[PDB]
Amino acid sequence: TIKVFTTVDNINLHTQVVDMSMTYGQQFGPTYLDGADVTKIKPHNSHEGKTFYVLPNDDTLRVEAFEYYHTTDPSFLGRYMSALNHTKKWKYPQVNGLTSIKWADNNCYLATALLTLQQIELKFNPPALQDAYYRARAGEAANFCALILAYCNKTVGELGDVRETMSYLFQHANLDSCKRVLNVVCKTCGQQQTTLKGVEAVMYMGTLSYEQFKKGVQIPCTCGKQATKYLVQQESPFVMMSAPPAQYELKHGTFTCASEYTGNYQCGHYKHITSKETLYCIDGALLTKSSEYKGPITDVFYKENSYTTTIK
Ligand SMILES: COCn1cc(-c2cc(-c3cnn(C(F)F)c3)cc([C@@H](C)NC(=O)c3cc(OCCN(C)C)ccc3C)c2)cn1
Ligand SMILES: [Cl-]
Ligand SMILES: [Cl-]
Ligand SMILES: [Cl-]
Ligand SMILES: [Cl-]
Ligand SMILES: [Zn+2]
Ligand SMILES: [Zn+2]
Ligand SMILES: [Zn+2]
Ligand SMILES: [Zn+2]
Ligand SMILES: [Zn+2]
Numbered sequence: 001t002i003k004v005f006t007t008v009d010n011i012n013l014h015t016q017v018v019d020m021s022m023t024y025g026q027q028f029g030p031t032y033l034d035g036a037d038v039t040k041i042k043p044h045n046s047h048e049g050k051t052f053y054v055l056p057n058d059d060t061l062r063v064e065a066f067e068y069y070h071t072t073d074p075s076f077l078g079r080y081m082s083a084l085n086h087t088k089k090w091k092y093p094q095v096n097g098l099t100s101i102k103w104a105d106n107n108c109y110l111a112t113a114l115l116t117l118q119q120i121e122l123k124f125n126p127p128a129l130q131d132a133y134y135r136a137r138a139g140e141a142a143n144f145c146a147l148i149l150a151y152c153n154k155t156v157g158e159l160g161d162v163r164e165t166m167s168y169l170f171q172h173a174n175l176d177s178c179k180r181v182l183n184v185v186c187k188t189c190g191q192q193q194t195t196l197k198g199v200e201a202v203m204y205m206g207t208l209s210y211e212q213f214k215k216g217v218q219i220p221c222t223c224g225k226q227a228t229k230y231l232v233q234q235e236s237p238f239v240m241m242s243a244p245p246a247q248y249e250l251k252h253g254t255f256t257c258a259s260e261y262t263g264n265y266q267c268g269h270y271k272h273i274t275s276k277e278t279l280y281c282i283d284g285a286l287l288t289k290s291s292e293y294k295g296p297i298t299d300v301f302y303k304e305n306s307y308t309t310t311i312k
Pocket of ligand 6: 070125
């Protein structure tokens with residue numbers, strides 16, 4: 001008989017006694033240790049006082065699991081530990097003061113998302129996400145990347161889209177204060193004003209230029225004719241302008257960071273462009289400096305606080 005620790009959040013810990021003759025699965029159910037599944041493994045002398053992750057089997061563990069991860073999905077813990085076993089072996093080099101990822105298992109889109117998150121203001125609602133967010137900013141980004149995969153229902157090696165990944169993450173962050181007021185003007189129907197909140201207030205698909213969104217874009221109307229949609233007010237710490245990959249010029253100082261995508265749809269590669277004192281390009285562990293940039297951009301991130309249009 002050996003005393004061990006079981007947990008669902010590595011915060012609230014529970015002291016259980018274990019027996020050598022029975023595997024961990026017979027006594028606790030699905031059980032993990034640093035990514036390894038010890039469900040089929042019998043306890044060893046080394047497995048003493050160590051902390052084990054277990055699937056929630058009682059109400060205390062079920063409540064603690066939601067308090068930390070904000071999900072009751074029974075597959076979350078398994079999909080999380082399955083990704084963690086990969087992300088712990090990845091390399092996270094410091095590139096231009098930012099934490100990146102050495103390329104492995106098509107993680108280009110994860111590295112681009114991780115680099116973007118270090119440059120925009122965001123507060124995650126699940127304590128698991130926020131804690132790993134902080135640890136990732138310090139350099140230990142293995143747990144954070146595994147959580148991103150779990151929350152996005154993506155597996156290691158699967159090909160991912162940065163805009164879709166950011167969208168999933170935004171829905172797990174506090175964006176209630178974020179407001180976007182738009183106005184569409186039709187020559188026949190008239191003018192109509194709509195107010196967006198939360199994730200819809202920080203993302204737009206159609207154009208890469210925040211300026212063009214302020215000038216107005218052509219959107220078809222209910223009557224069938226092309227109308228003009230322009231930004232009236234914007235109260236958010238940032239905005240994300242997305243468009244299908246097209247050739248675009250990035251000017252130093254006019255944007256925070258951007259996503260470059262080359263290759264065929266769903267099978268291609270992602271690079272990260274950020275606007276420090278000069279334009280930097282981060283391709284995983286690689287770094288190149290240039291004063292100008294023209295290439296296939298699909299996401300552009302801009303800083304914002306409060307904006308009210310001057311058009312009437
Ligand atoms: C030779 O071809 C070149 N080509 C490339 C493109 C192109 C067009 C768009 C786009 C998005 N929106 N639009 C719009 F039409 F709406 C279009 C987006 C991309 C890039 C960013 N993302 C992916 O390619 C991608 C998508 C993924 O999942 C999508 C499925 N979702 C679960 C729904 C998963 C992984 C990756 C890498 C590329 C078009 N032509
Ligand atoms: Cl929730
Ligand atoms: Cl949430
Ligand atoms: Cl900006
Ligand atoms: Cl398409
Ligand atoms: Zn939540
Ligand atoms: Zn691996
Ligand atoms: Zn791997
Ligand atoms: Zn109309
Ligand atoms: Zn790649």
